[PDB]
DNA sequence: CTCTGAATCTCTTCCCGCGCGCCGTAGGAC
DNA sequence: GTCCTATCGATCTTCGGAAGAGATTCAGAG
């Protein structure tokens, strides 16, 4: 919803979903581009933790 | 005798100190990496953290 | 023999991290403990990671983490951080060559 | 060698309404 | 002049809650 005009007063959930979706985009990337274990154990942890 | 008054001229001195602590954490690095040949103090600090 | 390692920087200041890293090497003159520093680029993967040819002493580890705007290595643990792989280095150099 | 006692940790709860007041996404990169 | 990607991947979230209950950790021993 707008705030005082088009200043976005985001409901917080859209920051949580934005966190998830970014991590899931990066994880699909680094899987299909076949990163090694030490890299996906970064992004996979960051995703579970999001 | 164990509880003391803090008044404005002390709370603002603390919250000003937080500003100088956040300048500290920048100006040290910029002074370390910086050439110290071009730099003048107004390049070193900036008001935004205070 | 110098093996590869992955460094995380503040994403966006990556070229400045690479330059400051080369300069810290030539300051603390552990020149025999660093080979290269890679930021690959396509007409930019990887988005925020700096590749370093290196060996592992705790002195050189403190050196790379004392380079400014560097978070830390990415590995299995923080005691003995992890090199990546032979064929993975070869494939990254392949796509960098191609 | 671990079985019922007890011991340290975290999680969860904390009146109902109501009226104002303000203040509300960021350091960075072409 | 600028469109964002992003978070202490080189600190320090506050001590001045009590409680009250459970999950989870350890005694003196058969």
Swiss-Prot record, chain A:
The RNAP catalytic core consists of 2 alpha, 1 beta, 1 beta' and 1 omega subunit. When a sigma factor is associated with the core the holoenzyme is formed, which can initiate transcription. Belongs to the RNA polymerase beta' chain family. DNA-dependent RNA polymerase catalyzes the transcription of DNA into RNA using the four ribonucleoside triphosphates as substrates. This is DNA-directed RNA polymerase subunit beta'. The chain holds residues 253 to 302 of 1407 of the full protein. It comes from the Bacteria.
UniProtKB/Swiss-Prot annotation, chain B:
It comes from Escherichia coli O157:H7. The RNAP catalytic core consists of 2 alpha, 1 beta, 1 beta' and 1 omega subunit. When a sigma factor is associated with the core the holoenzyme is formed, which can initiate transcription. It comes from the Bacteria. DNA-dependent RNA polymerase catalyzes the transcription of DNA into RNA using the four ribonucleoside triphosphates as substrates. Belongs to the RNA polymerase beta chain family. This is DNA-directed RNA polymerase subunit beta. The gene is rpoB.
